[PDB]
Amino acid sequence: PPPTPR
Amino acid sequence: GSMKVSRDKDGSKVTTVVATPGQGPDRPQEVSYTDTKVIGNGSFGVVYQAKLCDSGELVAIKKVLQDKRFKNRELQIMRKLDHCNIVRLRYFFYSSGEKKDEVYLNLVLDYVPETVYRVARHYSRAKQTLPVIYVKLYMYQLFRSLAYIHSFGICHRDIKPQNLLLDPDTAVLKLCDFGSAKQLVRGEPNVSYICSRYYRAPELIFGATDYTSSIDVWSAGCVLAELLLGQPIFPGDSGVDQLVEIIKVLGTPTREQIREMNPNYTEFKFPQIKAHPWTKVFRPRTPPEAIALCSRLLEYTPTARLTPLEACAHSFFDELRDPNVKLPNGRDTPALFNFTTQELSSNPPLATILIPPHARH
Amino acid sequence: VEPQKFAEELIHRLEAVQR
Ligand SMILES: Nc1ncnc2c1ncn2[C@@H]1O[C@H](COP(=O)(O)OP(=O)(O)O)[C@@H](O)[C@H]1O
Ligand SMILES: [Cl-]
Ligand SMILES: [Mg+2]
Ligand SMILES: [Mg+2]
Numbered sequence: 522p523p524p525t526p527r
Numbered sequence: 528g529s530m531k532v533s534r535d536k537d538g539s540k541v542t543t544v545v546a547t548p549g550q551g552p553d554r555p556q557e558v559s560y561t562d563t564k565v566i567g568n569g570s571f572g573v574v575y576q577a578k579l580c581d582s583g584e585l586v587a588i589k590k591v592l593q594d595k596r597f598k599n600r601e602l603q604i605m606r607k608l609d610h611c612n613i614v615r616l617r618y619f620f621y622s623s624g625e626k627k628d629e630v631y632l633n634l635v636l637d638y639v640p641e642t643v644y645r646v647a648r649h650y651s652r653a654k655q656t657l658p659v660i661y662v663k664l665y666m667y668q669l670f671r672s673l674a675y676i677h678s679f680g681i682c683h684r685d686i687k688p689q690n691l692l693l694d695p696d697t698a699v700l701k702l703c704d705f706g707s708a709k710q711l712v713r714g715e716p717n718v719s720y721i722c723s724r725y726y727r728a729p730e731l732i733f734g735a736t737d738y739t740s741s742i743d744v745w746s747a748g749c750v751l752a753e754l755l756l757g758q759p760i761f762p763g764d765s766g767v768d769q770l771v772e773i774i775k776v777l778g779t780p781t782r783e784q785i786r787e788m789n790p791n792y793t794e795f796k797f798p799q800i801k802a803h804p805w806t807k808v809f810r811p812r813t814p815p816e817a818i819a820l821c822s823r824l825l826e827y828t829p830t831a832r833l834t835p836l837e838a839c840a841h842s843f844f845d846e847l848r849d850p851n852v853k854l855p856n857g858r859d860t861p862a863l864f865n866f867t868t869q870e871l872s873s874n875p876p877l878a879t880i881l882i883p884p885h886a887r888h
Numbered sequence: 889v890e891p892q893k894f895a896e897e898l899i900h901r902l903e904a905v906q907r
Contacts, residue, residue, distance in 0.1 A: 522720045522721050522722065522723070523597050523707075524597050524598050524599070524600075524684075524706070524707055524709065524718060525597065525598050525709075525717065525718040526596060526597055526598070527595065527597060527598055733894075734889055734891070734894070766894075767894070767897050767898055767901055770898060771901050771902065771905065774902065775905065779902070789891075791891045792891055792894075792895060795891075795895040795899070796899070797895070797899055797902060798899065798902040798906045799906075800902060800905065800906055800907075
């Protein structure tokens with residue numbers, strides 16, 4: 522799972 | 528980025544780059560390495576092993592693509608870290624790669640040959656259980672690294688066996704992979720879909736955005752349970768699958784516990800499933816104090832979970848504080864009591880327990 | 889992810905495993 526989007 | 532590629536003294540390909548050291552002010556220096564080979568690969572990028580030409584020491588080079596879509600704090604987080612149970616960032620530099628006219632970030636780290644996952648997998652396919660002494664050693668060092676990063680307000684957000692590097696000879700554990708890590712600030716929301724499957728805290732599965740560093744403690748509890756059990760304790764493809772496994776062990780959370788995790792779920796009528804006793808969860812030969820510790824980590828209410836520093840002081844690790852303990856290979860245990868003021872900042876009086884009298888001399 | 893839809897699935901699953 523990826524971190525928060527920009 | 529400029530990268531001089533040449534050969535030297537044996538036809539061995541030598542790569543020269545100008546790399547910035549991990550610590551201190553930015554003072555980049557020429558770094559030469561050889562014997563480059565891929566030891567890891569994925570959608571994140573590539574991981575190479577290489578040998579520094581000067582010292583001859585082995586290093587890992589994590590080469591990740593500068594993705595403008597998401598936020599990556601991996602570099603900025605690793606640069607401020609310096610602890611014996613966290614993998615060291617020696618240098619970093621920028622270069623090109625597969626994508627045309629694109630820029631990649633290269634992280635030069637200490638090379639550590641094994642992981643907790645690979646070691647655990649050996650015992651699983653051999654139908655053996657990891658000796659309790661190693662469970663103590665690995666878990667203790669994990670909690671120290673957590674106590675360290677939490678003191679800066681940094682949450683790893685991806686604690687799992689694959690991210691725990693091991694040097695089996697010295698039994699030293701090093702936490703790695705800070706691509707999901709973040710400095711948590713109260714009042715500022717965080718992404719909920721974080722942490723790897725099997726190790727995701729219940730509040731994360733419930734979709735909380737106001738979670739704290741205690742999610743790392745839950746994940747650590749999952750690692751502990753896994754080492755004792757020989758397999759993941761809460762497997763499942765989806766969040767619901769994993770939550771069912773958790774409920775089958777802990778029992779249905781109370782309304783108050785649900786509120787502590789995510790208030791938006793307090794008014795639903797979940798069926799009441801009885802808890803399965805921890806002594807029945809693990810094998811009958813499992814040490815009572817390991818069961819006790821695990822039940823204090825795997826708690827629904829995040830504030831009820833032990834802090835990493837408190838976990839180190841738990842009775843399960845009492846053996847490690849014995850003067851006459853040695854590794855099964857014959858060597859002494861790694862450094863375990865060299866706590867700094869920063870590590871103890873969360874709870875200074877714990878030093879009485881954490882530092883045994885035979886360690887103060 | 890609606891809390892309603894999520895709880896609905898969870899309740900369904902828990903009823904299946906409930907003694
Ligand atoms: N410093 C290292 N030395 C040796 N192996 C490493 C090192 N760092 C990472 N690895 C190995 O490469 C794998 C990927 O590293 P990691 O940082 O976790 O990448 P990712 O962010 O994609 O998960 C790890 O599972 C680990 O086994
Ligand atoms: Cl039940
Ligand atoms: Mg990883
Ligand atoms: Mg990562």
